């Protein structure tokens, strides 16, 4: 049944575990939120452009160019995709510690207890008071995109996904998508004589796509007694591994054989002289086998062009860089460490006066990192003790430029390269992503662990059907309408598959553990606890605590 | 089920295609709108007349006479008939390009989510604020005319049909129909001494028809939980052809045989001398066969009296002229090119300051056009090189009048005449029409491609049942009542039949294609895209891109 | 699914110099014929 | 931030210092349309001739 | 008769002159020494620039499969018998698997 | 430049290297990483699972 | 080329390919084995490997 | 001539027939030959590689 005065759904946020057999777990995560929806600020679609004359007009500022072209819509999307939505911090600890790999299974979603209210103002004498009252006949439009016709638009990009706190209400992300303006921009250094083109092109007859929610899809009209239920969507994806790899290229294979065991705990072991050592190496003209030059099964990780900007018709952009360990060289960019900026709803702390809170995610998987300053290329024919001209060192200048070194432009990717798939991030991390429709596809998307093979889960779009006053002129440029807002509950169920880790190691494994307050380490428990006034903060948890044997 | 707080319908505007077999397509077009209905400005029927003393009082202004007699009704009609309602511009492109002929099949309609609200004013001190609130007990009257008892009154005539934009709300057209006043008016030229009768007659006992919605039809009363559904109406109509004909009367049949192929690409071919040529001609006393005078199977298109005004009892009116190609003579009227005037809702642009936007539709089907200035009649017995007195040329004066020429009054229509049926127009075009009840019927209606053979689809009439105050005097001349307005959704489904075009031609066919902005051609894509502020414009698309072989 | 009209391959009148001028797909007086590359993939697509 | 007033006017965005997003650049607090993280590289530079 | 086929798929193109590499640690408004610009000389050679020898292909790279050409285009091709095979042949849209 | 230059791309095809009768390795185990090399260098055969 | 992760500097592998008439072994990644009498060598050889 | 057929929703079977008259000449040599082209003129001068 249903109707006004009868609630159409229930609130379940709790997470469940079930053991299907040996090592297997079915993780069923419920999540529910109250969502606050405002009447759209314009009833009609708009094609708008941002263009920076101030930033890009001055020389050398290219990196900050924001210029693009977008289609603004009245619709808003409820985006359930982040890790921080589905799990509470302890459930993330329990999973990160105990399980080798995890995989997505199904997703369900529902909307219920729709409530639309209207606002009037009185009496305007002294100070106005705003009176709130229901419209029982009003409705809310709801459209799900099953076929992914519309441009796929993850909200986590801007951190607009549903809030991470069950008890706080949350808001939708207004739906919008790109349009093709064909920007032109020119390259300069800090102080340079000349001009900068900095122009944007006219609309393209070939490339112009304009989509409309109403034309594209079926819209459900939900009044207070109505409820909407998405069917069960089943993921097809590859599981991801929850245990990090420590094992470098130089740790692969059989170690050399030591001559004899050391006498005392301080003493170092010794090896057969490199001249007489037996092994396999690709160096020519020298009779040696040494731990550095011996042949390894594959390359682990690879050098990458870093802080390079490639420019197609759209404009300059930094190409992605696969997340890899930061070596002791501390250099973040060459290894592609992610850096998030996020608000109080998703993170930060309610005590913080700053507008946003920022965190750099330094990758685990210590095997694939690259120290940039210590990488070097050596001349052929090979020689021990190269003179300066026989070795390519990072300290030298490239093209006569001081701060540009070969490791900037150098690219090692090849058939022999192996790297681990990067890791999920509990708050602020993206759970899944849609695969690009191109024929030749990337081996991984950079931000998202899971990539739906065929068809991604559909986007869920909502808006308030307009409430019109007595006077409505369809030809009028301006539209007067009744101030209106609404609220509704969103409930969803995400099922997962995971497998317990075996532990064969003698020694204790590393684990995620809370720590007493008063010591400054990252895990101090005060940060997961409320304050006196209720200010709460939610910070990224390390993932993949447990080591793994690569080879 | 149903009730307050439970929505009675769904919103589907999308268009579907299905392939029934070889070449056949079933096009199912859904369309949906939000409709804004105001309480009628008078509760009772009225018989009113407009009579121009100012326009027609002065001499020679006859063409602008507006005088008529009409029955004004409180009811309003929801009129779904235009092409611009059902299809989006791309769906019109896809159909116009790929299909030879299309035909109507069925029509469905529904009304749901009725919402009635009332308006009060307070406190009138400082500035008044208008408070809006529901009447859950109020109802809306809905009457469909299945039997076409009432005068058939297409709203597109005045461009009052439902708006062409799915996301913008739209308004009904107030229902009204003609009544017979028997006007009298006299003919004068620009400055002339005399008087003009310019009178209108008394009501006629023979000809007076006064219809009332309540007496005529069954009315459904719809409250907020109620919904109304029209049955399925099935068209009986003849399909229309979507491919234009280029083939003139002089392109019919077998060409003459050339003597020999030309030597070079510049050289013209030569034909057997006209004295010796073999053929068939109706000219007498001359031994010739020439491409102009040879006999053709039929006349393609025909000369027409153009800008003639015939006057029955009602008054002077211009008789219609079948749409035909405009020849290189550019003359629009002789070939009957349609000219539309329409508003922002149906067209125009929201940026335009003008009240209306006007477009002249120049007919495709290049075969049937008539250059007026170059048509001529020649004396009998026929002669080559006629002296001035043997030929009737358009340049000569008729009846001693300078600008009146024989091509004005000349009428070629005969048994041998063949012409193509004119073409649909995506915005502003009328889909169907009802056939006149006269015994001897026209071969085509001029504006509408489809004409329902027996019984046209019914007219859908709606009004708000009156809300009365506490004081109601049935004998009072004036009626006070509660200010009331309402909104509801209209949804309809139009199924079509169409057939894919075969292409036997070597060369590429002409097609409707978008074009880059910045060039001024009619198809520049900017015109189908929103502006920054949301201003959108919708302009007529060419139809029948593909050529066809007449004979 | 797009509102606006899609781009299409279309012949064009002779006398304008654009690549699609129809004269190029038609024979000459002496029969000389020319066949030139046609654009492919006229219709835009949504990558992501 | 808001819809533009007239068809000529350009829209404006949240200041790059305060913008929320994801980028791989280090040591700078910004999010700008050029440096933000994208799912994959589309096309690639190539040794040519 | 000669014709240059300019690829459609406007997404994957590269303007060469405007591609640049920037030094680490990153900085806004790089001075000349912090940025690698196409205009500079490589190995002291005038017309040789880094974009000539630079190769971006990596795991993150996605590109569309090129397009057929109505006259003069090759319909199919045979796949090389090598063990490790190219992801696409350049001229031919279709490549027979076996 | 041939020292640091890397031509590997989508168009690249190469034969799988060859076994060596004495001193050659018959098989090898595949690394447990998610994204795996197309071949191990020394060993002709690589056990899938 | 020698790339260095946390473990230390190491030469990255190079797929075996033909040595061209340029005789250059390293660029084409030609394998070089060192082995003892048990697996090879000769029992007459005085050398260790 | 070329034919089209619609197998269902959205699917088309395109069947293209083509036919030609072919003109074959007696081969200019009855036996196999192993021939080489070598440019002394083009490649002899510098830079023409």
Author numbering:
A (entry chain H), B (entry chain Z): 37 to 587
C (entry chain Y): 540 to 587
D (entry chain Y): 295 to 343
E (entry chain Y): 393 to 490
F (entry chain W): 442 to 490
G (entry chain W): 344 to 392
H (entry chain Y): 50 to 98
What are the paper's exact sentences on this?
The T = 1 icosahedral parvovirus capsids consist of 60 VPs, with the protoparvoviruses assembled from VP1 and VP2 in a 1:10 ratio. VP2 forms virus-like-particles (VLPs) for members of the protoparvoviruses that are otherwise antigenically and structurally equivalent to VP1/2/3 genome packaging capsids. LuIII kills transformed cell types that are either completely resistant, or less easily infected and lysed by H-1PV and MVM.
To enable comparative analysis for identifying the VP2 determinant of selective tumor tropism by the protoparvoviruses, the structure of LuIII VP2 VLPs was determined by cryo-electron microscopy and 3D image reconstruction (cryo-reconstruction) to 3.17 Å resolution. At this resolution, the VP2 amino acid side-chain conformations were unambiguously assigned into the cryo-reconstructed density map, from N-terminal residue 37 to the last C-terminal residue 587 (VP2 numbering). The LuIII VP2 monomer structure contains the core secondary structure elements reported for other Parvoviridae structures, with nine β-strands (βA-βI) and an α-helix (α-A). The conserved jellyroll motif contains eight antiparallel β-strands that form two β-sheets (β-BIDG and β-CHEF). The LuIII capsid is ~280 Å in diameter from 3-fold to 3-fold, similar to previous reports for H-1PV and MVM. In LuIII, this depression is 4–7 Å deeper, and 15–22 Å wider than H-1PV and MVM, respectively, resulting from multiple subtle side-chain differences within residues in VR5, VR6, and VR8. At the 3-fold axis, the single “windmill” shaped protrusion is the same height in all three viruses, but is narrower in LuIII compared to H-1PV and MVM, and has the same curvature for LuIII and H-1PV.
